[PDB]
Amino acid sequence: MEIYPHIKVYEGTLSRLKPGGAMIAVLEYDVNELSKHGYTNLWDVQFKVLVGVPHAETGVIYDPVYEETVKPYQPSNNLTGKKLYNVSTNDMHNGYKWSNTMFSNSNYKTQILLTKGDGSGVKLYSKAYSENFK
Numbered sequence: 001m002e003i004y005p006h007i008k009v010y011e012g013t014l015s016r017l018k019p020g021g022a023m024i025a026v027l028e029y030d031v032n033e034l035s036k037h038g039y040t041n042l043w044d045v046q047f048k049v050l051v052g053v054p055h056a057e058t059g060v061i062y063d064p065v066y067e068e069t070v071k072p073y074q075p076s077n078n079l080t081g082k083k084l085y086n087v088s089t090n091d092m093h094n095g096y097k098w099s100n101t102m103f104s105n106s107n108y109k110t111q112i113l114l115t116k117g118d119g120s121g122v123k124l125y126s127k128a129y130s131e132n133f134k
Contacts, residue, residue, distance in 0.1 A: 019103040022091040037122040050111040054128035066101040
């Protein structure tokens with residue numbers, strides 16, 4: 001008899017930061033680095049998506065023109081010492097708020113803030129990104 005090994009087919013949508021659709025950020029952090037900044041339960045986290053202009057010295061968008069709270073999708077399987085979070089804005093259901101704002105002004109950037117579930121904790125920022133995470 002012919003052999004059919006177990007094959008998982010990965011399907012889905014990887015990261016997108018483009019006009020006309022939700023931001024999809026498939027982000028991987030280091031567990032050792034999260035644990036160090038006080039992240040004990042990697043499950044207990046909230047994300048804010050910040051749209052605006054970053055501060056020239058710190059890189060933080062302190063006065064976002066738009067913010068959005070996102071409950072991530074968390075893949076069950078992770079590379080050793082890594083932690084994936086899939087952070088996707090609610091554009092499809094909210095009037096395309098994130099994309100319309102982000103791309104209403106070519107100076108604007110999108111920055112992703114990780115905190116604990118209730119907003120506390122050390123604030124862990126992504127780079128303030130341009131289109132296509134540049």
